[PDB]
Design a protein around this ligand. Structure first.
Ligand SMILES: [Mg+2]
Ligand SMILES: [Mg+2]
Ligand SMILES: [Mg+2]
Ligand SMILES: [Mg+2]
Ligand SMILES: [Mg+2]
Ligand SMILES: [Mg+2]
Ligand SMILES: [Mg+2]
Ligand SMILES: [Mg+2]
Ligand SMILES: [Mg+2]
Ligand SMILES: [Mg+2]
Ligand SMILES: [Mg+2]
Ligand SMILES: [Mg+2]
Ligand SMILES: [Mg+2]
Ligand SMILES: [Mg+2]
Ligand SMILES: [Mg+2]
Ligand SMILES: [Mg+2]
Ligand SMILES: [Mg+2]
Ligand SMILES: [Mg+2]
Ligand SMILES: [Mg+2]
Ligand SMILES: [Mg+2]
Lengths: 169, 183, 90, 172
RNA sequence: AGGAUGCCCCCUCCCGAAGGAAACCCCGGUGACGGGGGAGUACGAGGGAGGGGGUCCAGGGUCUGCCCUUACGUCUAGAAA
RNA sequence: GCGGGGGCGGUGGGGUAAGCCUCCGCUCCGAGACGGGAACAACCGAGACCGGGGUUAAGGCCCCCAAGUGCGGGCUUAGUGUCAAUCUAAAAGGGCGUCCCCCGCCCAAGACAGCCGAGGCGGGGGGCCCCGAAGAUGUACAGGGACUAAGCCCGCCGCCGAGACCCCGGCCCGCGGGCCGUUGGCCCGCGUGGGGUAGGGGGGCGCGGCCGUGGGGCAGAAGCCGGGCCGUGAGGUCCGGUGGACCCGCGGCCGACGAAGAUCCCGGCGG
């Protein structure tokens, strides 16, 4: 897997319609809403933390999942799943392409160089704008320090700069 | 005797020679004035005395390491006496190199202007035994002393990069100081 | 190190009224003070002045902060600097 | 029926490298050389044209007194000859100020007569016959502020208000 | 074979495009500076007249000082290459 | 001519990216002088007939280098940095290092740190700087000198500075008009007239001969060496030396008709 800097910049149109894309990769994110998702339970919480993007860019699906585990594991063992709701707000609809000489990947991949340079599907990413909310945490005001620490941990696994915004519901 | 005066940048004499006391002046800022004087008066000669009292602003370690790199890491791999640089260390020759840097390069105008300059450490005895030594200052080139400000004289720089050469000159000052004090 | 004090007599070194004596009557900040001739005496209008644009003389007079031109005028009678303040430098 | 404002437009930027559409409008406004000045009437069609060439010219409301000196100092007739008082009096205009006031006040609609104007006898024409419809100004004394920035940000270009007369005084 | 009815210096006078000060007085700004007057003035490319002095002037060779300056022909989008 | 290219804009579409490939538009280079950019086709200013004077553009005003060691306020201690791009750079992250804005709480003198009697504690953000930050010929590189401002931020004042714009003189051009017995010449008017490769159009100079016309030459023709004058120029013409028999002006016509180059050909002669 190439460095994420190869796929950070938004350089072309979105590539999402999977009826026209051959071999479009499946989304390997198992869960998007962590904690207590039921609306009756979330009325206990009263504070909202948002990990907001600062630059527009593309976040790979593996980077989204990596930030998801480190943040959710920390809130699991420092806050308890019954004391928070954590949602990954974005979905990686954009399909990433790569142009490399490979195995049986179609007949036109055997031609080296920039001839027939349209790449094959190499992953998925989310295209985000500035101010877009990446992670959404509903929580109670006593655990504000822990939720910031978990969100700061998730920020360390993301390719673009992000800032934490804390506001009440 | 020695009469201190302030140099009139507009009333600069055209003929003869002026003497500038460099004590308390900034090296780059005084060199800028000296270079323009020698260019604007093609027949006038300039003498700078007390060249070791010139001042460079900044931390002593920073300035000394700057000079150390010049006299250590700047060299050539061809014939050194034919093609390489020859870096001065003495405060009078250090100041004369700054004025050469501020003069025009590879021209007779630059060559003649530097020949019309003489730089001395302390004050020469034949200058001291004249009837009336008219010295000058350039207040724009003078250094305004402020608390917690960093600078070093050229003499302190010379003692760092050539202590044995400095020691002989300092000893020579003490040897003749009785005679110098008479005048 | 330059000292400007209230009641100190200074000479302007910039502007139209350069070479004219004036009297410090108040301090605005650490950069600006208030000077006055008085006008009828030197021609220095009662404005503020930058400390970089005035040089202090060796004379002084005693007055209150924000002293009036007539108040400045009387204390010039106190030390008799009326002819001194009329002088122009250079 | 409507007396639109009378504006002065001066070309501040040059010919080489100007975009094509801005260049086309400047030609139609007769500003075909640098520092050329034209006097127009601020009709809605006129003001749309000046908006097109906003980043290449400066403009403002011209006063009657400034136009009078502009006519005397830089007015030219066919053959590039200077505009004199005698030529004005031969056509029914007593003074430079009188002809400048009439155009600024709206008493006459154009300053220079058209190509197709037919000179009459006795009747005073509503313009100056055979005056060139452009002025060639001097570069401004004391310089400018910025020829690449707008007047509203401390530059030169754009709508200047009544300060166009001060610039015209510096450009005569 | 060119001018020497020349050329340069000084002086004097006159006209003079675009342009255009200074001292000094007054108004303003902390100030760099702006404005009224001085003043469209002194001056100003060039165009006329005269007086005195000198002797060659134009032109050429070579050198020096200051300013400017990247052999030629060619293909090329692009040549000092 | 049917090889284009530069800058900017369409996240153009593609590509990890490319001084990359392929489209769309304005402008510029090719085929465009000149000022600034340290050099530099296409970045900024600007469009050049010749000479002169003046004023400005971009940009600059400590020296190199014309013009300011210009003005007020603040920040930086790192020589950090040293007025856009080409062009020599810097990220995530850490720092109350330092200057500043804001918010929450305690202190109602019983606040914090160890009775004392004035502020204290914590949070977010902003500016600059430090760490992160490693290279191959020669110095704190990005012009050099050097500078603690001659750096950076908010504002300001004047000046320098092109061939551009203004003015004067001279020249040529396009078009219109007029005059002259005219394969043409001359004069006047007007032109926000005056760059130019390939190419198209219009006029002239030279060389050898021919048809005419007029001349020169042993008191010295052609040729050769140097020089003056005329013409924007191709060129013409004259003077002095050498030479020893041919040659030239004007009108017309015709060509085996113009060289700096072809690893050009022949000869001669060099380092
Ligand atoms: Mg793209
Ligand atoms: Mg050694
Ligand atoms: Mg030697
Ligand atoms: Mg441009
Ligand atoms: Mg003769
Ligand atoms: Mg080739
Ligand atoms: Mg090629
Ligand atoms: Mg070539
Ligand atoms: Mg093609
Ligand atoms: Mg293109
Ligand atoms: Mg080509
Ligand atoms: Mg340049
Ligand atoms: Mg200079
Ligand atoms: Mg540095
Ligand atoms: Mg990066
Ligand atoms: Mg042409
Ligand atoms: Mg013939
Ligand atoms: Mg050829
Ligand atoms: Mg041969
Ligand atoms: Mg040989």
């Amino acid at each position: 897997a190439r460095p994420a800097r190869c796929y950070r910049r938004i350089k072309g149109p979105p590539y999402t319609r999977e009826e026209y894309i051959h071999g479009a990769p499946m989304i390997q994110i198992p869960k998007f809403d962590m904690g207590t998702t039921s609306a009756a339970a979330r009325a206990a919480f009263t504070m909202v933390a948002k990990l907001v993007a600062e630059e527009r860019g593309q976040i790979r699906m593996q980077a989204l999942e990596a930030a998801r585990q480190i943040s959710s594991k920390y809130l699991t063992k420092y806050v308890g799943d019954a004391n928070y709701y954590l949602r990954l707000n974005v979905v990686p609809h954009h399909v990433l392409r790569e142009n490399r000489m490979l195995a049986m990947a179609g007949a036109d991949r055997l031609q080296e160089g920039m001839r027939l340079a349209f790449g094959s599907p190499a992953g998925r990413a989310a295209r985000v704008e500035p101010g877009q909310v990446i992670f959404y945490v509903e929580f109670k005001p006593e655990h504000l320090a822990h939720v910031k620490e978990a969100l700061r941990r998730a920020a360390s696994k993301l390719p673009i700069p992000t800032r934490i915004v804390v506001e009440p519901k | 005797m020695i009469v201190k005066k302030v140099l009139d940048l507009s009333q600069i004499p055209e003929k003869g020679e002026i003497v500038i006391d460099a004590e308390g002046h900034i090296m780059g800022r005084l060199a800028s004035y000296v270079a323009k004087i020698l260019l604007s008066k093609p027949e006038l000669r300039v003498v700078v005395v007390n060249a070791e009292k010139l001042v460079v602003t900044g931390d002593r370690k920073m300035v000394v390491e700057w000079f150390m790199r010049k006299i250590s890491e700047w060299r050539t791999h061809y014939n050194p006496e034919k093609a390489g640089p020859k870096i001065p260390r003495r405060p009078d020759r250090v100041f004369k190199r700054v004025v050469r840097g501020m003069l025009p390069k590879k021209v007779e105008s630059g060559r003649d202007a530097l020949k019309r300059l003489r730089v001395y450490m302390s004050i020469p005895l034949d200058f001291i035994q004249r009837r009336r030594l008219v010295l000058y200052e350039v207040p724009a080139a003078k250094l305004r002393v402020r608390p917690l400000m960093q600078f070093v004289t050229l003499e302190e720089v010379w003692r760092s990069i050539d202590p044995a050469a400095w020691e002989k000159w300092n000893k020579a000052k003490e040897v003749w100081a009785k005679k110098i004090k008479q005048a | 190190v330059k000292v400007i004090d209230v009641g100190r007599v200074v000479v302007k070194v910039l502007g139209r009224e350069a070479g004219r004596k004036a009297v410090v009557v108040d301090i605005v900040d650490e950069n600006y003070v208030v000077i006055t001739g008085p006008k009828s005496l030197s021609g220095v209008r009662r404005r503020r002045v930058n400390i970089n644009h005035i040089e202090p003389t060796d004379k002084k007079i005693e007055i209150k902060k924000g002293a009036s031109d007539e108040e400045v005028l009387k204390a010039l009678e106190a030390a008799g600097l009326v002819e001194y303040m009329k002088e122009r430098v250079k | 029926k409507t007396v639109y404002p009378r504006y002065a437009v001066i070309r501040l930027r040059g010919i080489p490298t100007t975009p094509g559409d801005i260049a086309a409008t400047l030609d139609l406004l007769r500003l075909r050389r640098k520092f050329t000045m034209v006097v127009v009437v601020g009709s809605p069609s006129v003001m749309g044209m000046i908006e097109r060439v906003n980043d290449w010219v400066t403009w403002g409301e011209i006063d009657a007194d400034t136009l009078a000196e502009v006519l005397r100092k830089r007015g030219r007739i066919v053959g590039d000859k200077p505009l004199t008082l005698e030529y004005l009096q031969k056509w029914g205009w007593n003074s430079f100020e009188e002809v400048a006031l009439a155009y600024i006040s709206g008493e006459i609609e154009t300053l220079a007569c058209k190509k197709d104007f037919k000179a009459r006898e006795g009747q005073r024409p509503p313009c100056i016959p055979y005056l060139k419809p452009f002025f060639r100004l001097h570069p401004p004394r004391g310089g400018l502020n910025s020829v690449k920035l707008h007047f509203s940000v401390g530059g030169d270009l754009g709508y200047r208000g009544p300060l166009i007369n001060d610039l015209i005084k510096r450009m005569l």
